[PDB]
UniProtKB/Swiss-Prot annotation, chains A, B, C, D, E, F, G:
Subcellular location: Secreted
Official protein name in the record: Alpha-hemolysin
Consequence when changing H26 to I/L/P/R/S/T: No oligomerization nor hemolytic activity, wild-type target cell-binding
Superkingdom classification of source: Bacteria
Keyword Lipid metabolism carried by entry: no
Major site of localization recorded for this protein: secreted
Alphabetized PROSITE patterns for the sequence: AEROLYSIN
A biological process term (GO) from this entry: cytolysis in another organism
An annotated GO cellular component: extracellular region
Domain notes per entry: The mushroom-shaped heptamer is composed of a cap domain (comprising 7 beta sandwiches and the amino latches of each protomer), 7 rim regions whose protruding strands may interact with the membrane bilayer, and the stem domain (52 Angstroms in length, 26 Angstroms in diameter) which forms the transmembrane pore.
GO molecular function, one term: toxin activity
Length: 242, 242, 242, 242, 242, 242, 242
C-alpha cells in the first residue's frame, strides 16, 4: 500500500462516565490530540466505550424477554453549528468472501448523523441454526433464548440461561466503535453540540406451547430503552466534558 | 523484494467535507508532503473517503429499488493544465488463484482519467448463490433484495431488509481508494483542475409475481445520481480546498 | 484501524498477595502509572491474578465432588465514594463465527460493579461430548469427573483423576482479567473502597449407579467458597495495599 | 538466512509519465540512490509502473476482440555503451508446490536484454475451467470472453462484459516489475541508452456459431501494439528523464 | 489488550548447576533484576532448566521399565520466612478448543507451594492410540514402550527402542518452567529458603505374554527418584547460590 | 532459540557481471564487510546471482530438446592457498514432513569444494504427474516438454511451449545461493583463488511416435554447457573483481 | 510469557574449520561474548556447524551402502576440570500433537556429556511409507535406497540415486545445534577440555533378490566413522582454537 505508491512513508487525553438507573447503560468517551504544525487543523476522536446491559430478564409472567435486539449508537449533531463529520471507523467493510453473530453496520451516514446498529445476527442455540436478530420461525418463532426443547418445569423457569446464550445478550455488548468530525482551522467560532442517542432496541421472545411442540413469537421493538443522552464537547479547551 | 535486490533498503496534511441533500453523498480527501531535498518534486495523494449512501429504498409503489449498482469515483482533469497522473492504488491486482462481493476495478486509466468502479459482485441471499451487480436470472431476475421466497404480506412491505442484505447496499460503501498525479519541479506554472465525478450508478430490482413463483427484473442504470462535484486542488499552498 | 482513520498515530508499579487457609485461594493485583502532562487524570489498573484452587476432592463418602463451577471475581465498590468504573478488559467479545471449555463472561456491569464469571463450559471426557458447567444428562447427569464407564473398584476410588480432567478443575484457574476505574483530576477528595468478592462457585457431581448403567447428579451451588476479601486501594500514594 | 550464516547482519528520487493516443499506454519509472562511501558504485532501479490498457473492445463487426494476450516489457540497451545488467526482480521463482491467472515470466535474459512477459494464464469464465492466454478449445476455441452459452441478442452485444472478465483484460494490467544495471565506478565515461519496448501482444477471440453450439477461434498476435518507447537515462545527474 | 484499554502502553543475572550420580538429574536456575525507582520492590525469577534423565532402561530381568511417569518440580518454602509466592508461568491455560503428549499442569498452588507435574500424556506407538502416563489397557496394559507386536527374540531385547519412543522418555525432559515470589520492600529482614523437590515419578511397564497375545502391566510409582535438592536464594546480594 | 538459551541476545559492497555468447549465461556476485573490533577476522559472502538460460530450443530436426537438467554452481578452490570454506546457506534442510519442482541440493561439500545442484524435480504437465529431472517413463519417456497428447501438426512445431512449462526451463533459473570461506586473521599471506564451475547440465527430451501412442526418450547429459568461469577474489582490497 | 509475568521485560566472535580426508567430515564452531557488568560470569556458545558427508556410495560389489544412519555430535569433557554444562538448544521439545524425516534427539545429557543423535526418521521412497533409520521390513528389509522395484540393469547400477533420496543421505547433514557450559566467575583457575566425538553412524542397505521379489537387509553399525576430533577451548583469551 504505502510502499505500493513508492512513498517514503510520511503520510492530551481524558475520559468520561455516566450511568442510568432506570435503563442501566454505561457510557464513555476518550480523546487525543497532537500539536502538529504541519497538519491543517485539530482532530478529536470519539470512542463509544460503555456497557449497554442486555437486561436479559423475564419481566412479565410464554415469557416476555427484554433482550437487546440491536444496541445502536449515533453521534448526531445540530445543524446550526459549523462542524462536519469525517471518519467512522469501523466502516461497513466490503462483504468479503463466515457469518458473525453481531454484524456491525454503519447506518447510512449523512454528513451530520453517523450511527451504527451493532445488530444481533446468527446465534447457535443448543447445536442448531443461525437465529439472527429478527430471527423468526414458523413454529419456534424467534429462537434467541429457547433453554431447551423438552422442558418439564415452570415456564418462568424455562428460559434460556444467560450463560449459555451469546455472552452479549446476557450482560450486554460494550460498543467498540469510533468516529471523528472536522472543521477549518481559521474560523473565528468554535462551538458544537452532540446527541449520542444511545439505543438498546429491546425485543421480545415469547415461547408459547401448542400442546404438540413449543413455538416462539417476537414483538420487535416492543420497547426501546433509547435513553438519549446528549453529550457536550469542549473543543477549544482540548477536553471532552458531559 | 528489497532484500531480493540486495539493496541497503533506501529507495503537511488537511481534510475536506461536503454533502448533497438531493442525492445524499459525503465526500472527503486527505493529503501529505515531505520536504525531501533528495526527492525530485512534490507529491500529493488523494484519498476518496466519503459515504455514497445506497438510498436502498422503495421509491415507487413489484418494487423499484434504488440501490447502488456500482459506486464509481473518477479523478478526471482538464487537458490544458500541465499535470500528469502517476499512481492509482488500489490497482487491478493480478487475479490470483475467492469471489468477493464488491470486486473493485480500476477502469482503463488513460494518462488523464483514472476511475474505479467498486462494483457489486456476488452477494449470498438467504443461503443461496452469488448474485453480482448485473445479477439477472431467468425466473427471479436480479436477486439483490428478495426478502424471502414465500411472502404473504403487502409487496411494498416485502422487500429484503437492509440489515440482512450486504451492508453496503443498505448504508452505502465508503470509498477506500487513492491515486496521485505528477509533474516536473522546475516548471514556472503550477495550476491544475479536477473533476471527481462521484457516481452512484443506481439500478432497479423489480420482483414481479407470476402466480406460480416470484420473479425479478432489473432496469440497469434506470438512474445515475452521478452528482459530479468537481474539486479544486491548491498545490503551491500545500493545501487542498474545494 | 489507526491508519484507517489516517491519524499520525498519537492517540510506578507494585504487587500484593494473600491466602485463605480454610478456602485456599491466592489473590494478587498489579498497577502502573505515567506522569503524562497531556493526559487528563490518573489511571490505575487491576490485575486479578491469583489461584482459586479447585479443591477437586471427594469430601463426602456416589461421591460429592467439590469442584469449581465458575470462579467469579467482582471488583465492587461502595456508593458514597466519588469514583467511577471505566474499562473491563476482557469484554464479552462479539461471539464471532469453536466452543472453548471456559467461556469467560463479563456479567452485566453496572457503573459500580463489574464482575466476570469465568465459567466451566464444555469439557471432553474420555473422548466424548461437551459437558459445560451446568452439564447435566438424563442418565449420566453432570459429566465433569466420570473416571470411566465400566469401573470395578471402590466408588470412592472411582472418580475422574484430576490429571485427565480439565487442568483447571484439578488445580484451579488463575484469573487473567483486568479493569480500571476513573475520576476527574481536580476533585479535592480522593478516597475509594473495593469489595473484590472472590468466588469459587462450588458444585457437586454425584455418580449414582442404577444397577444397569451409571448415572450422575449435580447439586448446583451446594456450597460457594465466596471468600469475600475486600481490598484497599491507596490512590494518592500511587500504591495498592490491602 | 542472515542469521543462518551467523553474520551480525550488515550485508534522490524522481518520476516520469507519458501516454500514447493511438495505442493508449501509460508509462512510468522511479529511482533511488544512497551516498554509501562503503558501497562500490552507483545503483539505479527501474520500476515499470504504468497502464497498458487492454482495449478490450469489439473493433470489427463472431467478434474480433482486441485483448491483451501478454503485456510485455523489456528494458533493452545498445551494445556499444559500457553498461551491464544485474538484477531482475521479480525472477522466475522456483515453481514451488495454485495456478495464477497471470504467471509473470522473466524471458531468458541475456546480459543486455531482460524482459518479462506478464502473460494471461488461466481465467475462470462463468464457473468453468482455466483458459490461459493461448487458451484454445476444439469447440469453444479460446475462452477468454464468452459472455454466456445460450445468448439470444445481437452477437455484437454478446461479448463477455469487461466487468465479469479478469480485471486485467477490461482495464489493462499495471506492470509491477523492476530491474537494475551495473558498471564499475572508476570509468571515465558514463553514457547509456534504453529501449523499453512496451508491448501489448494483442490477440483475437472469435466466437463463431455452428448452429448446434457456439465455438471460438483465436488469431494469436493478430496485432501487437508494441509501441516501442525508448527511454533516456541521465545517470551522472542522478535523474531519469525521457 | 493494552490498546484495548486505550493506555499509552506503560504498564544482574547468574546461573547454577548440580548433578546427582545415583539418580542422574541436572538442575539449573537463572535470575534478573532492574533498578526501577518507579517499581515497588525487588523481583527474582526462577527458571527450572535442567535435565531429568528418563533412565529408560531395563533394570530387572516381562521387563521392568524405569521410565519418567511425570517429571515434577516444586519450589516449596518454609513457613516462618516472610516471603510470598506470586506468579507461576506457565499456568494451567484455559483448556481451549489437540491432545499434547506432555500436558504440563500447575498443581493446585497454595500461597507457599507451587509445583508443576509435566506429566506424560498420549504418545502414539507404532501408528496407534494415545497412551497417556497412566495409560493402562485390559490386554496390552500400559503401552509406552511396546517395541512391536510380533517379536521373536529375547524379551530383554524386545523393549521399545528409546529412539522411536517419545524423545522425552529416552533422554528425559528438560523443564522449561518458571515462577516468582514477592515481599514488601521496607521490611527490615530478608532471609528466605527453598525446597525444590525435583521429582522423577518413576513407573514400570511390564509386557507379560499370555501365549495368545502380549499384554502389559504398570506398577505406578514403583519408585520415585524424588531427589529433593533444597536450594538457597541469596536475595540481598542479588545472586542465587546453592 | 536465542531467548531459549536466555542470552541477552548479542551473538563495503560491490558487484560483478559477465556473459557467454556461445553458452549464454549471466554471472554475478555481491559482498559485504563490517569493521568489528570484537569479531575475530574478515568475512566475505558470495552470492551466486545470475541467469543460466535454459536455451529451451529445438536444436535438431522426435525433437532434441536442449533443456537445463540441473543448473549447478560450485565455488571450488586450489589446494595450495591457505583459505578454508565455512558456511553454505542454503543447506540441505532436514527433509521435514510438499514436493517442490526444483529441490536444491548442497552436493556433499568437502572442505574445499561446495556446490549445489539446483535440480529439476517434479513438474506438472497438462494436469498430470510429477516429472522430475530424470523423469523417464516406459511409454512417454521423460515428460518435461510434451506440448500435448493428440497433436496433428509438424513435430518440430509440436514441442511444449516455454510459456506453459516450468518458468525455469523456458528462461533459465537465476541462482539464489550463497556461501562463505574463512581463515585466521594474523596470517602474513592472503591470496586465494576460485573455480566457479557454472554448469547447465543439458539433457534431451525425444518424443518418438509408435503409431499407437507417443513416447519419450531422454539422453541424459547429452551435453553440458559447463562453461567453467574461474573467478578472482581480491580479499585485502575489500573488493571482488573477476 | 514475559508479559504474562508482567515484567518490564529486562531478563567477540570467531570461527574454526578442519576436514578429514579418510572419513570426509567438515567441522566448525562460532562464539560470542558481552561485557555485561550486571551478568554474573562469562558465557561461551558452541555451534556444531559442519558437514558430515553421507558418503552414500556402493563400496562393495545386493550392495553394501555406506549411508549415515545417525550423524551424532557430543561435546564431552574430562572430569577433573572445574567446568559445568548448562544449556543444550535444541532440546527434546515436548512431542506436541507430523513425522519429520530426521527427528533430532538430545541423548540423555549428564552434567558432563550432552550429545545429539540427529537420526534418520521416516523417508518416503517412490511414493510409499515412512522408512526411518532402523527401517527394516520382512521382505524389502530396510528401505532407504531402493532405486525402484522392477529394475533390469546391473545391480551395482541399481541403487537409489542420491538425488531422489533424502538430500541428507546423498550429501550429508550439516549439524545446526548448539549448547553452552558454565562456571563461577571468581575461581582462580580457568582451564577446560573438550571431546567433540563427531559421529557418522554408518549403516548398510543390502537389496538381495529372492527370484520372486526384491528384498532388503540392514547391517546396523557395520561401521562408524566416529572420527573423534577433540577440540580445545581457550576461554580466558576469549577465543576458541583447535
Ligand atoms: C423425546 C425424544 C426425541 C428426542 C430425540 O432424540 O430426537 C431429536 C433428535 C436429536 O437426538 P440427539 O442428537 O440424540 O439429542 C439432541 C437433544 N434433543 C433430543 C433435545 C434435541 O433429532 C433427530 O435426529 C430426530 C428428528 C428428525 C430429524 C431429521 C428429519 C429432518 C429435519 C428437518
Ligand atoms: C412451501 C414449502 C416448500 C419449501 C421447502 O421446504 O422447499 C424448499 C427446500 C428448502 O427447504 P429448507 O432448507 O428446509 O427451508 C429453506 C427455506 N425455504 C423453504 C424458504 C427455501 O428446497 C429443497 O430442497 C426443495 C426443492 C428442490 C431442490 C432440488 C432440485 C434441484 C434444484 C435446482
Ligand atoms: C462392556 C463392553 C462394551 C464396551 C464397548 O466396547 O462398547 C462401547 C463402544 C465403544 O468401544 P471402543 O471405542 O472400542 O472402546 C471405548 C471405551 N469404552 C468401551 C469404555 C467406551 O461404543 C459403541 O460404539 C457401542 C455402543 C453403541 C453406540 C452407537 C449407538 C448410538 C449411540 C447413541
Ligand atoms: C438449455 C438448457 C440446458 C442448460 C443446462 O442446465 O445444462 C447445463 C448444465 C448446467 O446447469 P446449471 O448449473 O443449472 O446452470 C448453469 C448455467 N448454464 C446452464 C448456462 C450452463 O450442465 C450440466 O450439468 C448438463 C450437461 C452435462 C454435463 C456432464 C457431462 C460431461 C461433461 C463433459
Ligand atoms: C501375524 C499377521 C497379522 C498381522 C496383520 O497384518 O494384522 C494386523 C493388521 C495390520 O496390518 P498392516 O497395517 O499391514 O501391518 C501393520 C503392522 N502390524 C501387522 C505389526 C500391526 O491390522 C488389521 O487391520 C487386522 C486386525 C483387525 C482390525 C480391525 C478389527 C477391529 C479392531 C478393534
Ligand atoms: C481421442 C479422444 C480421447 C481423449 C479423452 O478424452 O480421453 C482421455 C481422458 C481425459 O479426458 P478429459 O479430461 O475430458 O480431457 C483431457 C485432455 N486430453 C483428452 C487431451 C487428455 O482420460 C480418461 O479419463 C480416459 C482414459 C482412461 C483413464 C483411466 C484408466 C486408468 C489410467 C491409468
Ligand atoms: C509388473 C507390473 C505390476 C506393477 C503395477 O502396476 O502394480 C503395482 C501397482 C502400482 O501401479 P501404479 O501406481 O500404476 O505404478 C506405480 C509404480 N510401480 C508399478 C513401479 C509400483 O500397485 C497396485 O496397486 C497393485 C498391487 C496391489 C496393492 C493392493 C493390495 C494390498 C497391498 C498391501
Amino acid at each position: 500500500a504505502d510502499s505500493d505508491i513508492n512513498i517514503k512513508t510520511g503520510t492530551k487525553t481524558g475520559d468520561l462516565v455516566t450511568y442510568d438507573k432506570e435503563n442501566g447503560m454505561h457510557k464513555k468517551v476518550f480523546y487525543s490530540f497532537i500539536d502538529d504544525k504541519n497538519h491543517n487543523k485539530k482532530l478529536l476522536v470519539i470512542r463509544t466505550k460503555g456497557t449497554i446491559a442486555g437486561q436479559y430478564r423475564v419481566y412479565s409472567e410464554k415469557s416476555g424477554l427484554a433482550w437487546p435486539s440491536a444496541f445502536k449508537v449515533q453521534l448526531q449533531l445540530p445543524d446550526n453549528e459549523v462542524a462536519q463529520i469525517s471518519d467512522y471507523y469501523p466502516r461497513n467493510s466490503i462483504d468479503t468472501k463466515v457469518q458473525p453473530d453481531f454484524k456491525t453496520i454503519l447506518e447510512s451516514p449523512t454528513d451530520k448523523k453517523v450511527g451504527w446498529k451493532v445488530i444481533f445476527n446468527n446465534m447457535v442455540n443448543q447445536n442448531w441454526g443461525p437465529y439472527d436478530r429478527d430471527s423468526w420461525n414458523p413454529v419456534y418463532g424467534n429462537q434467541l433464548f429457547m433453554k431447551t426443547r423438552n422442558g418439564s418445569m415452570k415456564a418462568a423457569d424455562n428460559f434460556l440461561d444467560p450463560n449459555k446464550a451469546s455472552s452479549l445478550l446476557s450482560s450486554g455488548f460494550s460498543p467498540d466503535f469510533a468516529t471523528v468530525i472536522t472543521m477549518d482551522r481559521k474560523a473565528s467560532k468554535q462551538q458544537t453540540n452532540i446527541d449520542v442517542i444511545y439505543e438498546r432496541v429491546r425485543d421480545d421472545y415469547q415461547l408459547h406451547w401448542t400442546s404438540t411442540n413449543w413455538k416462539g413469537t417476537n414483538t420487535k421493538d416492543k420497547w426501546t430503552d433509547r435513553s438519549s443522552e446528549r453529550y457536550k464537547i469542549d473543543w477549544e479547551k482540548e477536553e471532552m466534558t458531559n
